Symmetry: D2
Subunit: 385 residues, 4 copies
């Protein structure tokens, strides 16, 4: 039995169908939650769609989470130079836990005993949402209609819609990336069609004039661009526009999913692609060698945690504590030249934290002698190469 559900609501047809199914099947009050995380969608019409579908005004939640997304999710991940399978900048994965947590809290606030979502019943996304929910409200009933209902025909789905009264690609968009799947992308041996890419110019259409930019960092996080101190969303947005302008950040991979097998997708990560390059350059003059190398060793594990939906887990908090500690002296400035898909570092400096700033050749002799000991012992023991 269930009395009141918080639904992740986009205003789209499928979650509108879900909204009606909740009211009828579980016979409950539905609460809607719509979040701005850089989708580039007007929030208002969702309220109106929700109203026309029977939601009470007070049960309609519209929240702008752009700044918080970049501040408490995006920047913290980039401290690690997190990249999944050497290519993927985790744009979908990093955004999920922000949504699930916020939804869980609205549930708590409204007294709602259940939450719900329109994620696929066989994709990564259902896992990401539910792990998040249970981190913040482990007593919540979880309703995944895609997994529950008998509505598994298109015809039996259209019929239901009737009874209860853009780009052709399957897309996920936020301040960090735009994702594309479906259509020709289904064949990983087939190239994408050019008109699919909606956000960034191609490097071919990007300007013939390169552009220099300067990025200021404080404790590993971006704080200014060309001397301009913006809000976190402000900063990532600016980098996006720069990346888009110059055709930066496109990616074509098949990736291993947490749930199911391999999947082919394309991604536009204009700002984040620039962020990663700059952040490495920052660390290169400001981080102790072994501190940087230790974080490199632990990065893939961290990237998989994020990918798989384990942002809100003890593991990840442990890894974050390590990561953050590495970032204390990561203060400085990086200079980059952008040109048709290229992010070239051309300068890095730091006002108080550069380690780029006696020992002699006899000292180096002794360092070599002691590292070579095991090789001499081994050689004498028959283990010559």
């Amino acid at each position: 039995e269930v009395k009141k559900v918080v639904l992740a609501y986009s205003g789209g047809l499928d979650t509108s169908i879900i909204l009606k199914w909740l009211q009828d099947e579980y016979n409950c009050e539905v609460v809607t939650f719509t979040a701005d995380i850089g989708q580039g969608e007007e929030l208002e019409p969702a309220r109106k769609k929700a109203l026309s579908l029977g939601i009470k005004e007070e049960n309609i939640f519209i929240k702008d989470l752009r700044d918080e997304f970049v501040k408490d999710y995006v920047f913290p991940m980039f401290r690690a130079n997190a990249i999944y399978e050497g290519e993927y900048l985790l744009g979908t994965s990093i955004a999920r836990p922000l949504i699930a947590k916020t939804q869980a809290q609205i549930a708590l606030q409204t007294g709602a005993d259940a939450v719900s979502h329109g994620a696929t019943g066989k994709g990564n996304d259902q896992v990401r949402f539910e792990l998040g929910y249970l981190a913040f409200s482990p007593d919540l009933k979880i309703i995944a209609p895609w997994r529950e209902w008998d509505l598994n025909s298109r015809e039996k789905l259209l019929a239901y819609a009737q009874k209860h009264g853009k780009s052709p690609y399957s897309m996920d968009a936020n301040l960090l990336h735009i994702s594309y799947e479906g259509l020709v992308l289904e064949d990983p041996a087939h190239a994408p069609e050019e008109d699919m890419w909606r956000w960034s110019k191609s490097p071919k259409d990007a300007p013939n004039e390169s552009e220099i930019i300067e990025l200021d960092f404080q404790k590993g996080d971006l704080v200014a661009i060309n001397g301009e101190k913006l809000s976190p969303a402000g900063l990532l947005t600016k980098l996006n526009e720069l990346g888009c302008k110059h055709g930066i950040g496109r990616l074509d991979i098949v990736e291993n999913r947490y749930v199911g097998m391999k999947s082919r997708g394309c991604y536009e990560t204009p700002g984040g692609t620039i962020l990663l390059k700059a952040h490495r350059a920052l660390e290169s003059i400001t981080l102790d060698r072994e501190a940087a190398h230790l974080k490199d060793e632990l990065m893939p594990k961290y990237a998989s945690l994020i990918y798989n939906g384990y942002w809100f887990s003890p593991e990840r908090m442990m890894l974050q504590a390590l990561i953050d500690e590495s970032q204390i002296h990561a203060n400085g400035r990086v200079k980059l030249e952008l040109y048709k898909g290229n992010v070239m570092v051309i300068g890095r400096e730091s006002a108080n934290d550069s380690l780029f700033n006696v020992y002699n050749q006899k000292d180096a002799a002794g360092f070599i002698k002691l590292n070579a000991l095991r090789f001499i012992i081994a050689g004498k023991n028959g283990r010559k190469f």
Copy 2:
């Protein structure tokens, strides 16, 4: 006391000075060893310079090691997607052990009791050479004149040269990369001058027409390019020309050295930059997820081993065994589009080894339920987020 030394000889002024110092100070027979590993230098004049300096013909060793470099050093490293500090493709580091081993073997073959080299007395390179020597011949006397002699003035160096009778950058070149240090590069806050780059076109001078290429892989190694089966050096050379043509592979970093602190260098890795991208794409459809992820986790450690000069070590052999085992089914074809600095994957396929090739939503429900158990137990124990 020393009777006979094998010297790494380039024909340059400094190693010519070293050659004379060996003959006089240690009072010995010098053996010269010059190797082609893609430097783009004629080998012959080194023999002639060596002759004019008093080396016996039979003590002059000129060897072409290009194929072996790519086959037994370069390709094996790329199986790991090895990259140092997220940027450096290890062009200098990977080449060193091939030279040190070959030098050690000429020493053994000729009956030479010592080896020698012109590497700096305070750089990474001396370590790389000596670790290698002692892997193959741990009884060898090692003579590092840069560390030993009293010739530490330029004036006292010119005087010695007299008594015993191009690009301004400090460069290291081989089939994998060209390295640049010195001059304006000394200031990491200063951009490089455009005329420094000797190998690759800039992306600005690269053609306005993109180029498609197809790369065939067998067990993780490149075997063909556009259907053409070349020798290993042949293959890497072809990729180099493609990379150079399209302005691919440039890099500007400060890196942490094994010996000493941080150093600013620029690198041209045209072929290798393309290789890495393609190799990831190959693995993306042919490697089991956990096998790929495990290798990712161990990559930085492997990269540091290579960088620091530990190619010929038990560690690295252990890591290689793991790496190679991951590569057994890494057979297939990758398609890429090159354009002004960009290496875009546009297709990947495999004839017999693609894992891209039942479970339902109820199955996914149970997978979620069991992963979420610890979160529910934790939540009940007060550990809600």
Copy 3:
């Protein structure tokens, strides 16, 4: 639809009930498979029980797998010094894949289209079995009656038995260990009762006279005990008797399960506890430092793979290749004194492979100087501790 099933059959009441349920519900021919892996049970009566229950003679499979268990499963794992959560020697986990693989092969051999087992529907064991099955025969239908049937009462279970015609602890026994769960052990705050331990003397009842033993190793594996070369099962059995005699190998832990939460169990691993100590001692004089340390770093991951049921996986094969490569020169002899629960190393030696077998104080000065560089650079940059 299913025609013929291979059942893991012990002759016990529950798998006898399962055998009858298979014949009736799936309406098929049942094949029985009983394996000796050190349970200390006579195999014969299982054949007779199977006959009385309607199994054809030719569908009764009785196999002795003791030698193979130790040779291809136990010894390979011990090369890694595998221990789960710093205590558990994986006795149950390591035995499972041998059973699942053998069962899968009998299935293939007999033309059987399904396999089945009596493992709990909510324990670790079902996972271990099924991962194994699908490694060897991925087309096999898997029938887990504990998960499938409507027989979830004890009364409805007794009724079924009727219609189709020792220690009180829940135990798992093999050549490596005996496991105990249930009864008083359910409370982790409660001590076990003394009469539970069936295999080993307590240290209190163990003799007042210590015993010296000598263990010979070849490539990391035990090959002889006190000069006696035995079969692999022979060797582990001998160590068991020695361990039992002296009250060695008892353990009391709660452990984290793969499936479900935490569980309290007791374990007797007499031979394996001695094996681990000796194997470390062997490595201490025969393994290169970094090779040993690298294997230590990767051990927990390897232990979890084994625990969770991923013996037959690409990951584990990769890790094994690394592990085995570390073992090449692991030849030698270890001497230990056993006394009332204690395994004390008192000697280790090696005939051709000991690295226990010049450098001076000035050399050490230079080694220190170069390692301390980063600390001096940091100190000058304000980062003093």
Copy 4:
């Protein structure tokens, strides 16, 4: 040139010789520093020896660091279950940085421009001291007379002593352990003689009556023993006496040194051996699985850092932050039975933090199905085992 040195002074003959050599060779004022860290030596006579040797009263520093040793060095390390090469509890390694840091601070306080120590010129200990010094005072001149002086004869050492006016084993003792090297221990194939062990009873001489103890933990650290809340030194001392009484904590290994090769040593770690066992038991009911497993994976790296002398390093601080974060909910009580060398866990409980505290068999089916997907995809692709 050097004016004033802080010397690590024990009052022994060798550091008394060093004290006189400093005054004469560097022609400086010597400051003495003697620390109590559990050596079981009276501190007073060191002051008197120092006075008779010409040290000013105000330049004699006698400090009790027992509580701080356990609190800020020993307990923090045990949070990680740190053990080196699977055996060594790091008693020497963990104590060093406390001494080096304190010495560096006395140097700073007194205005001393140099520090000095009597550590061997070819052992691990010189490295540990100097890394520590430079963490706290990177400008300090470091004087290692063992590496510097021409006093490398015993006869030329006795002559110097004259001119300027117990157990036979080489031992290191502190609150955590006693170390033994030298004499018969030199041959790793030779057993130690029984009269060498000075701290703990042998298990043979240990009482025939077992003893139960209860250990309370708070955030991963010991806080009480049998209900008794003691100071940190107080706690470790109590555990030592318990361990010694029952013959617990003896160890015989060859270990790999940081500097030089392999070395054979014996160790008595009575309290620490008990601490480790109890701390694992605590974690077993209070730590999330993945948090515990992640810390296990990173333990050897952490142990090597400690061993090699890198306690005061960015790496170690990063690892500590991770380790400490794992310990937040590590509150509870462990019960153990001690008997003749054995540390048996017999109970563990926690008042508010135990995770030992719904899902069904159908849920487990779906968890299995999704983990087995890659095996089925692989099997269909020819990769059957």
